[model samples]
Target: NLYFQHMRHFARTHAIGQIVPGKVTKLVPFGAFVRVEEGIEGLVHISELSERVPDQVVQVGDDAMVKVIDIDLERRRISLSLKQANEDYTEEFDPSKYGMADSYDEQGNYIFPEGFDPETNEWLEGFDKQREEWEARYAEAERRHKMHTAQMEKFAAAEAEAAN
Candidate 1:
């Protein structure tokens, strides 16, 4: 078991949740293997590749970014995910919380749908202003709705009197 002990120690030293750049050493139906370090390879399962067919997505000798998900110290096997390594892994966008305006352009499309700019590290100026205006518009819409409900009630009462 001397070799086993050595592998366990090596696995511990590498740790988990680490991202490593590697080349696709080989591909199988189940997944692809990437050699991150000399003589040390990790398995990136087919599900982690993407939503597309694995064979069509990546091939042997292609560069891949992988995130270390699991390490089987006893078996010296490493589990990696290609998708997690490449993705942002942050909270998704919520249009309501951001107070996005429901206003549409002449073409009947949302004027400001996706407003955040990753490259500039700032939200689009128009969208920022739109959010403030949308909050006021939302409050006005609620008031108008209440007014319309009351007006409908009065109209219904007059119709009842006319029928009597």
Candidate 2:
């Protein structure tokens, strides 16, 4: 529960991490630090940075999707696993493996795996549901960001007004 709570802090406060998207901040011989959002970063250890322990396919400022493995608040560290996320759906390179690729079959047919019989006709149906949920969350984050920006702007305007 405690671990889940920490995960929530970043998932709700910063970014909802699931194959989290991030940009590299710095490089090291052993790994790279990636900023997932404005104030959250996770370390992509060298071993987990690629599918086959790459020599170097990533560098500083590269965009990547990382899997959250550990959260160390005491030391301000987050351990990530890029390989793990890559392995979640496929083991080899295939352009058609993307979640939304062919999500809906031709003739307006909804295709799911051969045997998964759910109430919904197709997997794409859930995509909209997820999008709506994430959109709501993004809206909330945007509102908070605007409020913060407005407060800073007010302070700046008052300072300039006094100066004039």
Runs in model 2 lying further than 4 Å from the true structure? 1-8, 11-17, 53-55, 90-164
Candidate 2 lDDT by residue in tens digits, 1-164 = 36545645774443222445568888877888888766677788888865552335466665665666776666667887766755553323222222222435556455554433467644443366655654565555444334334433544575588689
True-vs-predicted CA distance for residue 112, candidate 1, Å: 42
Tens-digit lDDT string for candidate 1 (75-153) = 7788988766545232332222112224445464655436756578567877867556655755654543343344334
Total clashing residue pairs per candidate? Answer: 0, 0
Cα lDDT for residue 73, model 2? 66
Query: Listing every candidate in turn, what is its Cα RMSD in Å to the true structure after a full C-alpha superposition?
Result: 22.9, 14.8
lDDT (C-alpha, whole model) for all candidates: 0.61, 0.57
Angstrom error of the Cα, residue 91, model 1: value is 15
